[PDB]
Design a protein around this ligand. Structure first.
Ligand SMILES: NC[C@@H]1O[C@H](O[C@H]2[C@@H](O)[C@H](O[C@@H]3[C@@H](O)[C@H](N)C[C@H](N)[C@H]3O[C@H]3O[C@H](CO)[C@@H](O)[C@H](O)[C@H]3N)O[C@@H]2CO)[C@H](N)[C@@H](O)[C@@H]1O
Ligand SMILES: [K+]
Ligand SMILES: [K+]
Ligand SMILES: [K+]
Ligand SMILES: [Mg+2]
Ligand SMILES: [Mg+2]
Ligand SMILES: [Mg+2]
Ligand SMILES: [Mg+2]
Ligand SMILES: [Mg+2]
Ligand SMILES: [Mg+2]
Ligand SMILES: [Mg+2]
Ligand SMILES: [Mg+2]
Ligand SMILES: [Mg+2]
Ligand SMILES: [Mg+2]
Ligand SMILES: [Mg+2]
Ligand SMILES: [Mg+2]
Ligand SMILES: [Mg+2]
Ligand SMILES: [Mg+2]
Ligand SMILES: [Mg+2]
Ligand SMILES: [Mg+2]
Ligand SMILES: [Mg+2]
Ligand SMILES: [Mg+2]
Ligand SMILES: [Mg+2]
Ligand SMILES: [Mg+2]
Ligand SMILES: [Mg+2]
Ligand SMILES: [Mg+2]
Ligand SMILES: [Mg+2]
Ligand SMILES: [Mg+2]
Ligand SMILES: [Mg+2]
Ligand code: NA
Ligand code: NA
Ligand SMILES: [Zn+2]
Ligand SMILES: [Zn+2]
Lengths: 104, 96, 85, 52, 89, 33, 143, 115
RNA sequence: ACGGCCUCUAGGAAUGAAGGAGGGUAGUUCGGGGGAGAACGUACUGGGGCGUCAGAGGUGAAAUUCUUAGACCGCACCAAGACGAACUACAGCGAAGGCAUUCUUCAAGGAUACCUUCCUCAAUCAAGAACCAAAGUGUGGAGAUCGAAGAUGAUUAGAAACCAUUGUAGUCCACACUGCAAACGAUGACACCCAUGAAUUGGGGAUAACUUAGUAUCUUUACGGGAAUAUCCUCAGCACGCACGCGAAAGCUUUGAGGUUACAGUCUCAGGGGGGAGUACG
RNA sequence: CACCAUGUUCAA
């Protein structure tokens, strides 16, 4: 009914472009426009602190001088999965305009 | 840019020079020694082309191998008919 | 207190920054230059925004190269701005 | 063996010297898949789709 | 004045053989009876004289190509491929 | 939901029901003439 | 170009000076400027090119300011004016080149769209020139 | 030189300058194509007149890599350029002597010997 | 520059070039714009080759399913059809629909630059014309993946749904149709005025109402007198937080939904309580 | 992320 967002929930200004090719949601595979989907670049450790300690102890390669490899993933979620996984939450109306331009 | 320039010189010849259309008239100019340039379409029959080049070689007349066919050559001259061979006898202001 | 801007008589700083067609009275940005050829050693008047092929009469060498805006003068040649009027 | 792979051919000899037995009907052709110099053979795609 | 609204050349068949078979045949029939460009001699004078056989009224050349048109799209693709492979060698 | 009260079935399905109804009526007239 | 056929709003253009007097350092006579204009025309150059060459290599900013006559007027007086107006000639040439490309490239729908705009521009331009009798009546661009 | 065909797969990244204040360092496309052509010309020139053994030495010791970045930086400021993948796509007919020349002195194997 | 015989001699008298339109030239500018051709990239699936042996798959839990006739898994390959990840942005291009690997090509297109040309040629538009995502239709191809219909297994009081394993038409290409989208900014086109801060894409320029009020950094033997940054100015483009004013409010704000009862710049489309109904008839 | 269907008519 009422216009909830000025940008309509996507990064597509009225005279920028017509169509943005959709992507599959990282979790459920739902097709959503790439400029709309909630995008997160995640750098995860391959092992938690305890397991990495044990593997580093047994490794002649990995130790204090050589770090273990990490996983790098660009995850794009549909809106429903982003909310349900708590990657993003409903916010107060005045806080909806708050944007972050770098990972904190 | 193979055809754009020669078309421009053809237009200038068509406007301010003296030319002849057709193999027979072109050969007559070559025999008379009055030809300054001979333009040959790319679909000219091989025996006719070879005869024209041989005449031009004997008369030391320059040859331009046009990148279009006889239909294109006639259009470039501004005519509504095909021409295999064009012989320029006066260059006018073309500089070709 | 400072001087208020007058629309009919703008200041030098305000007028100098404006687009040539956004000035109070529109006018050209271009000019003419006397160019001495590095090879012909002769003076030729060259437009500051020349887009065609400018060549020295003697050497037949290009005196400038066209660009998006002002023409670029070849190295060696000396240029002098001629008066606008 | 002298024809490059990927070329489109017709009047193909099934046997050397048979003077043409494959790809003869109107609009038909064979496609050269590959050459095998070790055995001296050539692989073709016949109009029916079979490889020979 | 126009004598048929849409039948065109197929009007010789009257009400027989069905609209769709008539339409499909018409496209190829117009092509086979039409004059086609001759790359030699630069004229629009190629006419069919048998299935797959075309003779130019201008230069009298005879060319084997196409059941209902002078050159098929497959032949055009093959011509470019052979030229490209010839350059590659 | 992203819409207000339809005061009926979903309009897309009401449109489809009408579409099927129109198809049936034009078939009945065809068999009649 | 800018506004007709394609919602471009560009403003790039020349800005003619207020003072129209030829500069004092320009010693060339008006009769010689006319001679160069005719000579350049005989070499096949169009009036637009004639002005640019005089501007670039002769220090003649405005032929009209020097001779009192526009370049096309000088050509008309000497019988050197083009048979077809310059802008119409260039639009026709562009349309012909585009049609030549389309003969092979039948699926270049963008070019077909641009061709419609060019041919529409030609027909509107032709209507104006026939009205002011710069084109013969019954002149028609043929696709 | 010995008939080995390889595919090189170079990747490079643009970088901001030291004093840059812009929010991105995207490159003009004409510079990207210029970077591609210079990389292609250098790699073809350097690898076409050497054998596979010398080519592997150049690749594994980064001699070609340092040459590429040094000569490509003036075209475009690069954060890093590297050869991410080299693959042999066609090998010549097998030659026992060439293999032995590549292996030089072969260390002995004691696997078949008695314990 | 000076002087001199002969020949030719309608020829300079026209408002101005719109911060209106159209053309021209240039950087051989700019761009996921369009068309053509040749290649590349992993991945899905399949196929054998080379190994292994008891499970694999799938789910909330299972089953349909595959499997000692060797599944799943591992390595290197081969085939075929799609697709062009990360980089990918409140970024670019296009009239809209739309557009993303590289190289080679074919016509374009906007912007910028100009003391080039031209001279009202324009704005908006019934009729008419062309284009138009997906699905759908016709004829040939193609058919890896996904998958309307259908099949099987679960869940359930029922479940011919959601979930699982599949699978036809399709999904892809050529040509020809169709012209039904929340085809949306739910905001018609052209033109004028309009306050502030930080950015961004493309091209240029510079380093008693005052007469003129800086500045660098990095790379640098050939698409190289180069490339990118820095400060300032500028025109054109997509926008952000931000003063009037407006609005029923949400909100809009040089990007109006402002400049409107202090109501008139121009043209055009549509609406007149809710249903019946975008139905019936033609 | 197994499975949660329904609530007679006016009027406080
Ligand atoms: N292109 C040549 C032109 O022909 C003109 O003459 C033509 C016109 O008088 C007239 O042409 C008419 C035209 O007036 C009217 N506006 C349109 C009409 N279609 C034309 O008719 C013409 O074209 C149609 C098909 O296109 C033909 O069927 C018809 O036979 C033919 N007369 O008939 C002649 C066609 O042969 C004039 N002589 C002159 O404009 C010019 O020379
Ligand atoms: K979003
Ligand atoms: K919308
Ligand atoms: K933009
Ligand atoms: Mg709501
Ligand atoms: Mg949205
Ligand atoms: Mg745009
Ligand atoms: Mg859309
Ligand atoms: Mg360790
Ligand atoms: Mg002042
Ligand atoms: Mg809700
Ligand atoms: Mg509503
Ligand atoms: Mg317009
Ligand atoms: Mg940038
Ligand atoms: Mg004007
Ligand atoms: Mg296997
Ligand atoms: Mg990619
Ligand atoms: Mg209009
Ligand atoms: Mg479709
Ligand atoms: Mg069939
Ligand atoms: Mg499946
Ligand atoms: Mg509609
Ligand atoms: Mg809009
Ligand atoms: Mg609407
Ligand atoms: Mg841009
Ligand atoms: Mg604002
Ligand atoms: Mg009113
Ligand atoms: Mg009503
Ligand atoms: Mg109740
Ligand atoms: Na596999
Ligand atoms: Na096996
Ligand atoms: Zn999801
Ligand atoms: Zn012929």
């Amino acid at each position: 009914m009422t216009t909830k967002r000025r940008n309509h929930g996507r990064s597509k200004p009225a005279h920028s472009r017509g169509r943005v090719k959709p992507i599959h949601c990282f979790n459920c595979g739902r097709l959503t426009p790439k400029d709309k989907a909630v995008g997160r670049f995640v750098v995860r450790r391959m092992l938690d602190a305890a397991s990495a300690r044990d593997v580093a102890e047994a490794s002649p390669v990995y130790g204090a001088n050589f770090p273990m490899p990490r996983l790098y993933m660009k995850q794009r979620f549909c809106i429903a999965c982003a909310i349900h996984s708590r990657t993003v939450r409903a916010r107060p109306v005045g806080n909806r305009k708050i944007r972050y331009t770098k990972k904190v | 840019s193979k055809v754009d320039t020669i078309n421009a010189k053809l237009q200038l010849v068509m406007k301010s020079g003296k030319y002849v259309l057709g193999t027979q008239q072109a050969l007559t100019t070559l025999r008379q020694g009055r030809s300054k340039l001979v333009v040959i379409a790319n679909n000219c029959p091989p025996i006719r082309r070879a005869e024209v080049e041989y005449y031009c070689t004997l008369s030391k007349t320059p040859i331009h191998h046009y990148s279009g066919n006889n239909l294109d050559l006639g259009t470039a001259c501004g005519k509504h008919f095909r021409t295999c061979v064009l012989s320029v006898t006066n260059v006018g202001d073309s500089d070709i | 207190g400072f001087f208020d801007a007058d629309l009919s008589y703008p200041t030098v700083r305000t007028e100098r920054m404006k687009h040539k067609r956004r000035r109070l009275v529109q006018g050209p940005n271009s000019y003419f230059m006397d160019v001495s050829c590095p090879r012909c050693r002769q003076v030729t008047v060259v437009y500051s925004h020349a887009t065609t092929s400018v060549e020295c009469k003697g050497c037949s060498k290009k005196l400038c190269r066209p660009t998006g805006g002002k023409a670029l003068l070849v190295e060696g040649c000396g240029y002098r701005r001629k008066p606008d009027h | 063996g002298q024809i490059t792979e990927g070329c489109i051919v017709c009047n193909v000899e099934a046997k050397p010297g048979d003077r043409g037995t494959l790809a003869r009907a109107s609009g038909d052709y064979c496609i050269i898949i590959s050459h095998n110099h070790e055995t001296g053979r050539t692989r073709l795609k016949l109009p029916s789709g079979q490889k020979k | 004045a126009k004598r048929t609204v849409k039948m065109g050349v197929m009007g010789r068949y009257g009400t027989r053989y069905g609209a769709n078979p008539r339409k499909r045949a018409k496209k190829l029939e117009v092509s086979q009876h039409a004059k086609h460009f001759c790359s030699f001699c630069g004229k629009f004078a190629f006419r069919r004289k048998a299935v797959g056989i075309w003779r130019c009224d201008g230069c009298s050349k005879t060319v084997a190509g196409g059941a209902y048109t002078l050159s098929t799209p497959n032949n055009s693709t093959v011509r470019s491929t052979v030229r490209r492979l010839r350059e590659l060698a | 939901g992203t819409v207000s009260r339809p005061r009926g079935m979903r309009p897309k399905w009401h449109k489809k029901r009408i579409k099927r109804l129109k198809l049936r009526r034009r078939r009945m007239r065809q068999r009649s003439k | 170009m800018v506004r007709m056929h394609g919602n471009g709003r560009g403003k790039a253009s020349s800005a003619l000076p207020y003072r129209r007097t030829p500069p004092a350092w320009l010693k060339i006579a008006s009769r010689n400027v006319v001679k160069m204009v005719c000579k350049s025309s005989r070499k096949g150059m169009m009036p637009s090119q004639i002005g640019m060459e005089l501007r670039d290599s002769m220090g003649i900013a405005q032929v009209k300011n020097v001779t009192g006559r526009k370049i096309l007027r000088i050509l008309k007086h000497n019988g050197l004016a083009p048979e077809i107006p310059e802008d119409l000639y260039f639009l026709v040439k562009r349309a012909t080149q585009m049609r030549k490309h389309l003969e092979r490239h039948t699926t270049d729908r963008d070019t077909k769209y641009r061709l419609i705009l060019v041919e529409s521009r030609i027909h509107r331009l032709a209507r104006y020139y026939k009205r002011v009798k710069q084109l013969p009546p019954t002149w028609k661009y043929e696709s | 030189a010995d008939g080995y065909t390889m595919r090189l797969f170079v990747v490079a990244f643009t970088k901001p300058q030291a004093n840059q204040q812009s929010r991105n360092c995207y490159a003009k496309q004409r510079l990207v194509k210029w970077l591609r052509m210079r990389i292609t010309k250098m790699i073809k020139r350097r690898l076409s007149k050497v054998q596979i053994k010398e080519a592997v030495s150049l690749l594994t010791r980064n001699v070609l890599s340092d040459a590429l970045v040094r000569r490509c930086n003036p075209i475009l400021p690069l954060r890093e350029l590297r050869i991410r993948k080299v693959r042999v796509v066609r090998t010549p007919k097998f030659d026992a002597q060439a293999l032995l020349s590549a292996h030089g002195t072969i260390p002995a194997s004691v696997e078949a010997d008695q314990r």
